[PDB]
């Protein structure tokens, strides 16, 4: 155990702390502000100059997907063998891909793209549920018979957009099932009903 | 018949690391070109998980993503750190190089010509990262983390070349970095590769711009 330096919001640290909780893995979060990140300090002295900082012992790293990838492979959540550690690898860019164009929305684009974005979204969510279909017929996880960091960031992706665009994974039976399945699992359905999760906004500008 | 093959535009981009780490490695893979027309024929984008080229094979195992296919043969070959502390620096230095290769990136393909001064005048701020961690390992003197090559050395020894013909000098300011370009390309099997018509005779992007 284990620090979470961040802004007072979901964003990019929302999948480790599903993560962690559902692992009831215990954590310290250290909050930083508006004023104190202005400052400067702390930024200058973070490698490439954002948060998430995470502190496991003497370990100090950055990077939420290396944060991710670094408690997947401590906590065996990680595939059962290099050929599922690669799959992971693979749906976990893939989250990754559609988060920045989330970001980039909700940043920079969200008045003037949020239409194209929305008719875009069923083409960006098709593959996750084609994954779900080959494996297992999508009645397990997103990679082999385990849960994997990759889920837990799959799983917060899906959360966020069912905000944004309500109703997106109507049409995507397997997507449905599986977010009603991880949510339901205890220590993360507590987490996930917790003021510490529900009382934080999705992202640090009041637009999701 | 090689165990590895390679789908991908006749250009370097996002394959080329993985190339290098090939070639300085000593493993055989093929070469599976896709002209602009077939992709634009559109049934192998629809075939492609997330649409989109490199697809890389290893013998049954097909994967997508750049950084999926450079972990995995970093696990396979094993150039992903000693222990799992070091594993995980291997994946901090790794994400860095994807975050400025995005920028690079958003500029050859969208912005070239509007914002090529402020991405060069942004460049020293971005690359200090490489050249501190450097600083911080054996003095800069052997490789990105620990003292044994690991696929984020591959990364960002090819963001590091794409870099010096976007912005000539712009390792001047950074003597680890401009020394360790300097080794890493040297070692035999890559220099070698680095030479040849299969990595010379590609274009470094898909649109003439570098
Ligand atoms: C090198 C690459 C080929 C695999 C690559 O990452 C890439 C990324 C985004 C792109 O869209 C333009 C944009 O909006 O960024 C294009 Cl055209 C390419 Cl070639
Ligand atoms: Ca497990
Ligand atoms: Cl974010």
Request: hydrophobic share 40%; charged share 20%; net charge negative.
């Amino acid at each position: 155990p284990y620090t979470v330096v961040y802004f007072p919001v979901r964003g990019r640290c929302a999948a480790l702390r599903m993560l962690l909780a559902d692992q009831g893995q215990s954590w310290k979060e250290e909050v930083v502000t508006v004023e104190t990140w202005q400052e400067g300090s702390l930024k200058a002295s973070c490698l490439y100059g954002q948060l998430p900082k995470f502190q496991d012992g003497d370990l100090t790293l950055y990077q939420s997907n290396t944060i991710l990838r670094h408690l997947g492979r401590t906590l065996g959540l990680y595939g059962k063998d290099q050929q599922e550690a690669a799959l992971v690898d693979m749906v976990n860019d893939g989250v990754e891909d559609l988060r920045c164009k989330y970001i980039s929305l909700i940043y920079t684009n969200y008045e003037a793209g949020k239409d194209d974005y929305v008719k875009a979204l069923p083409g960006q969510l098709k593959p996750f549920e084609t994954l779900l279909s080959q494996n297992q017929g999508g009645k397990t996880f997103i990679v082999g018979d385990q849960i994997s960091f990759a889920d837990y960031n799959l799983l917060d992706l899906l959360l966020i957009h069912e905000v944004l665009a309500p109703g997106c994974l109507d049409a995507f039976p397997l997507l449905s099932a599986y977010v009603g399945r991880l949510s339901a699992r205890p220590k993360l359905k507590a987490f996930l009903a917790s003021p510490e999760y529900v009382n934080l906004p999705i992202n640090g500008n009041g637009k999701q």
